[PDB]
Amino acid sequence: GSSGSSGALFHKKLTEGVLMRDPKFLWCAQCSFGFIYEREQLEATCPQCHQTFCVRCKRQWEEQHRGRSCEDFQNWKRMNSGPSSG
Ligand SMILES: [Zn+2]
Ligand SMILES: [Zn+2]
C-alpha cells in the first residue's frame, strides 16, 4: 500500500499587497502590554515593567536559558534549583 497528499499555492507564489496578517504579538504575562518584537532573540524587555522575559515560555529569563530552549532550560531548573524552584 501507499499514502500521501500535498498541494498548495504556497509554493511558487510570492506575497503581494499583504499587510493584514499579524507578525508576532509579544507581551508580558501579567501586565500584557502588547508590543511587536518579531526579533531573532530571546531577550525581550517590556516598555513598562522593563523585565527580561522569554518570548516563548514567557517566563523570567535566565543566563542559563541563553543558548538553551524552554524545555532544556526547565530541566536545568529542576536539577540546579532542586525539585522545587523558589
Ligand atoms: Zn510589562
Ligand atoms: Zn523560554
UniProtKB/Swiss-Prot annotation:
<feature type="binding site">
    <location>
        <position position="54"/>
    </location>
    <ligand>
        <name>Zn(2+) 4</name>
    </ligand>
</feature>
<feature type="binding site">
    <location>
        <position position="57"/>
    </location>
    <ligand>
        <name>Zn(2+) 4</name>
    </ligand>
</feature>
<feature type="binding site">
    <location>
        <position position="49"/>
    </location>
    <ligand>
        <name>Zn(2+) 3</name>
    </ligand>
</feature>
<feature type="binding site">
    <location>
        <position position="28"/>
    </location>
    <ligand>
        <name>Zn(2+) 3</name>
    </ligand>
</feature>
<feature type="binding site">
    <location>
        <position position="46"/>
    </location>
    <ligand>
        <name>Zn(2+) 3</name>
    </ligand>
</feature>
<feature type="binding site">
    <location>
        <position position="70"/>
    </location>
    <ligand>
        <name>Zn(2+) 4</name>
    </ligand>
</feature>
<comment type="subunit">
    <text>Component of the LUBAC complex (linear ubiquitin chain assembly complex) which consists of SHARPIN, RBCK1 and RNF31. LUBAC has a MW of approximately 600 kDa suggesting a heteromultimeric assembly of its subunits. Associates with the TNF-R1 signaling complex (TNF-RSC) in a stimulation-dependent manner. Interacts (via the PUB domain) with OTULIN (via the PIM motif); the interaction is direct. Interacts (via the PUB domain) with VCP (via the PIM motif). Interacts (via the PUB domain) with SPATA2 (via the PIM motif); interaction is direct and bridges RNF31 and CYLD.</text>
</comment>
<comment type="similarity">
    <text>Belongs to the RBR family.</text>
</comment>
<feature type="zinc finger region" description="IBR-type">
    <location>
        <begin position="8"/>
        <end position="70"/>
    </location>
</feature>
<feature type="cross-link" description="(Microbial infection) Glycyl lysine isopeptide (Lys-Gly) (interchain with G-Cter in ubiquitin)">
    <location>
        <position position="12"/>
    </location>
</feature>
<comment type="function">
    <text>E3 ubiquitin-protein ligase component of the LUBAC complex which conjugates linear ('Met-1'-linked) polyubiquitin chains to substrates and plays a key role in NF-kappa-B activation and regulation of inflammation. LUBAC conjugates linear polyubiquitin to IKBKG and RIPK1 and is involved in activation of the canonical NF-kappa-B and the JNK signaling pathways. Linear ubiquitination mediated by the LUBAC complex interferes with TNF-induced cell death and thereby prevents inflammation.</text>
</comment>
<comment type="subunit">
    <text>(Microbial infection) Interacts with S.flexneri E3 ubiquitin-protein ligases IpaH1.4 and IpaH2.5, leading to its ubiquitination.</text>
</comment>
<feature type="binding site">
    <location>
        <position position="31"/>
    </location>
    <ligand>
        <name>Zn(2+) 3</name>
    </ligand>
</feature>
<feature type="binding site">
    <location>
        <position position="65"/>
    </location>
    <ligand>
        <name>Zn(2+) 4</name>
    </ligand>
</feature>
<protein>
    <recommendedName>
        <fullName>E3 ubiquitin-protein ligase RNF31</fullName>
    </recommendedName>
</protein>
